[PDB]
């Protein structure tokens, strides 16, 4: 929908994460479908710097009592860098359509009619499993 | 049956298709189309046969399999049974990315199969008389192709088959030899070595029987480098003099043995090095030639003390030779810099030139001695080799200093290439790289396999 | 002539000294040769020490006074940058054979020679 | 021998420098120089 679902106590970080990287991909191949769309990029600046700024809404009481999932919001600002970066590299190299190459290396978390995911790169696809992970630490994303 | 890699370069392709099946080549859609299949066989071809020269061609000797050649017919049906206009980026791109990239770890290497899937996508193009979709004409171009095989249709220079049939002739010879046909310590299998150390340090008393005094960091830190230079090398030379009296001791003396000289005794009859030597310096594998150069550098480091002890290191040419670990030299250069000019040690760039005195840079001194191989360098242009030329060629004098970031450069960015420059000619390890001025089509030098020793001897 | 042939000089001057040691073998080793030559020819061994795929470029009028294991000889001597191909071409000669390199080994021609006496021993080596 | 400088290490100082700002926020106030300050002390608690 077009207004925000931003309610983290609401949802694990498995969802949340997941939820916003399936969303990423829909947007950005309606996008270089349509037009090269430096307003994403925008949005995506704006949204991070609304988080980043909402950060320090948590960041000052810190130890509170039934308040907790700080953690959350920060293993959500490494998605965005990454969505940051990979917008950043198109803009560079100014890909035409979707079955350019460069847009099928980039990893790509569809959804099927069966409402269930189906993580797919190159031409290869798998399905989520749906293990409960919790919170855990997550990866710089490295060119390696 | 021994199951390996045909010998040649016509029997590589004639084993690779007769190993394909002609259904799977004749397709309709025909002409653009089985011209990249034979792309990807010469280029497999290609890629196999350039492991007979070593280090040249690739650093080791890296596995490629007749699977990883069927995952890239996998490749290329999926493309162009895929729909429309294959992109020649991305074959290269994944196929580098996992397929022949998935064995290579020096960067070098990684570059140099860049260069071969970049060229690949004309030809040497007399040799090279491609046809139409008849499977049997790319049969008969196979035999089209000669007999003996040329560097040429690779790359590399020509003196490269002269030094390499020299060495295999040996090979052979010796070999041929095999099929014709204690008290080797008391007699004379490794006097020899003694003798060539009796040779070296018989008027050097001073240099194998004084005592440097232990020291911490002095003022400016080329001082410190160079007095720290002093005390390992003593104590190398005197530890292989205590290594040596022993084992002279069990020969031409009255005593008994260890195990320890066993060790040393047992290395040196197979003529290797032994791991207590190569614990503290990595030299050469003869150790007739390892006593030579320690030798050398302790006569050397001497005269570095004797022309740094006024702080007139500035003026003099100077070699790399000489110096056990000449990285930190450089990035002891790098701290004097980073010192008297007045901005921090991250900020600052290493490049080196020909054309001139370094203007922007502290500190300037004269670096010559340099050995190149792959090519023929002159004053800002690399020329390529000829039949005849020579393997080593001796190079122009340098200038070396560190310059601060985001200042002009001697050289345009876009004109000149990385040289590693290694320590000798087995290419082991990478002390920094150096550019040198190219002027356009770089692609050569690339797959020349340019490289740069420090010294040799 | 096999045993010089496995290693078991102010004169020439057109040389370096890395082909002279070897000269100063032949000469004390095999007189002979040294004296059917006659090195100081300067005429057609100025050709022959020019010549790119100098196996075949044999100055002709020693052509019926040398075998051809003495070529070898001559070639060792002088240019070492030729003795693969030199043997190769000796050894064509000697046995009529059209390439010293071997056919590939298609194992669907292999599939059907053998019988079950005696097993298949495939031996590898890295990559295989 | 014994020396190392890997991901590892680095892995560690970021962490204490996350500890660190985690309680110089909750237990007082925010400024300049202390922000380039801490990276110092977090990482001479391996390095030393």
Not at chain 4, 25 to 34: D, E, H, I, L
Request: aromatic share 10%; charged share 20%; proline share 5%.
């Amino acid at each position: 929908s077009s207004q925000g679902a931003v309610d983290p106590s609401l949802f694990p970080s498995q969802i949340l994460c997941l939820a916003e990287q399936i969303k990423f991909t829909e947007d950005v191949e309606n996008a270089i479908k349509d037009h090269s769309l430096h307003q994403i990029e925008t949005q995506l600046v704006n949204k991070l710097e609304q988080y980043t700024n909402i950060d320090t809404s948590s960041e000052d009481p810190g130890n509170t009592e039934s308040g907790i999932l700080e953690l959350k919001l920060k293993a959500l600002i490494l998605d965005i860098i990454h969505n940051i970066d990979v917008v950043k590299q198109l803009n560079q190299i100014q890909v035409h359509t979707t079955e350019d190459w460069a847009w099928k290396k980039q990893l790509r978390f569809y959804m099927k009619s069966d409402h269930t995911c189906c993580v797919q790169m190159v031409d290869s696809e798998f399905q989520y499993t749906y293990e409960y992970q919790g919170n855990a630490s997550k990866l710089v994303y490295t060119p390696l | 049956i021994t199951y390996e890699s045909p010998p040649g370069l016509k029997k590589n392709l004639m084993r690779t298709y007769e190993s394909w099946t002609p259904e799977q080549i004749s397709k309709k859609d025909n002409t653009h189309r089985a011209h990249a299949l034979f792309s990807l066989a010469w280029f497999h071809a290609a890629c196999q046969e350039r492991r007979n020269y070593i280090p040249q061609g690739w650093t080791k000797f890296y596995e490629f399999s007749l699977s990883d050649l069927r995952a890239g017919y996998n490749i290329i049906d999926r493309l162009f049974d895929g729909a429309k206009d294959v992109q020649w980026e991305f074959v290269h791109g994944l196929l580098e990315n996992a397929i022949y990239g998935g064995r290579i770890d020096n960067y070098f290497d990684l570059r140099v199969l860049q260069s071969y899937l970049k060229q690949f996508f004309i030809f040497p193009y007399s040799v090279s008389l491609p046809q139409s979709c008849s499977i049997l004409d790319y049969r008969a171009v196979i035999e089209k192709i000669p007999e003996d095989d040329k560097p040429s249709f690779f790359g590399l220079p020509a003196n490269i088959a002269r030094s390499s049939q020299r060495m295999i002739s040996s090979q052979v010879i010796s070999q041929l030899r095999i099929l014709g046909r204690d008290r080797e310590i008391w007699s004379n299998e490794l006097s020899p070595v003694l003798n060539l150390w009796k040779k070296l340090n018989q008027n050097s008393n001073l240099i194998h029987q004084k005592v440097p005094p232990p020291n911490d960091r002095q003022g400016s830190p080329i001082l410190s480098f160079i007095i720290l230079e002093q005390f390992n090398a003593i104590r190398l030379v005197q530890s292989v003099h205590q290594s040596l009296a022993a084992l002279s001791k069990v020969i031409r003396g009255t005593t008994l043995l260890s195990s320890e000289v066993q060790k040393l005794a047992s290395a040196l009859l197979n003529q290797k090095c032994p791991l207590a030597w190569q614990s503290k310096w990595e030299g050469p594998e003869d150790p007739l030639q390892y006593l030579r150069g320690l030798v050398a550098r302790a006569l050397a480091i001497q005269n570095w003390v004797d022309k740094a002890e006024k702080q007139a290191l500035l003026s003099e040419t100077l070699d790399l030779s000489e110096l056990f670990h000449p990285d930190t030299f450089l990035n002891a250069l790098r701290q004097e810099t980073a010192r008297a000019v007045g901005r921090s040690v991250d900020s600052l760039k290493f490049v080196a030139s020909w054309k001139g005195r370094l203007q922007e840079a502290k500190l300037q001194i004269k670096i010559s001695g340099l050995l190149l191989e792959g090519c023929s360098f002159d004053g800002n242009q690399l020329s390529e080799n000829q039949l005849d030329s020579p393997s080593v060629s001796s190079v122009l004098p340098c200038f070396m200093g560190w310059i601060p970031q985001d200042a002009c450069g001697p050289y345009s960015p876009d004109e000149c290439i990385s040289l590693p420059v290694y320590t000798s000619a087995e290419r082991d390890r990478v002390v920094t790289n150096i550019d040198v001025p190219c002027g356009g089509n770089q692609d050569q030098w690339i797959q020349c396999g340019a490289a740069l020793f420090l010294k040799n001897q | 002539e096999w045993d010089t042939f496995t290693g078991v000089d102010q004169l020439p001057s057109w040389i370096d000294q890395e082909r002279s040691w070897a000269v100063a073998t032949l000469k004390i080793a095999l007189p002979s040769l040294y004296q059917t030559l006659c090195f100081e020819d300067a005429a057609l061994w100025r050709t022959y020490y020019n010549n790119s795929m100098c196996e075949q470029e044999f100055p002709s009028i020693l052509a019926k006074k040398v075998s051809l294991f003495q070529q070898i000889l001559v070639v060792q001597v002088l240019r070492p940058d030729r003795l693969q191909s030199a043997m190769a071409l000796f050894a064509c000669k000697t046995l009529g054979l059209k390439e010293v390199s071997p056919l590939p080994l298609n194992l669907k021609r292999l599939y059907k020679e053998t019988l079950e006496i005696e097993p298949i021993l495939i031996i590898i080596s890295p990559g295989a | 021998q014994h020396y190392d400088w890997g991901l590892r290490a680095l892995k560690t100082v970021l962490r204490g420098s996350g500890n660190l700002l985690r309680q110089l926020n909750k237990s007082g106030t925010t400024q300049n120089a202390n922000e380039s300050h801490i990276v110092v002390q977090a990482l001479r608690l391996n390095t030393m």
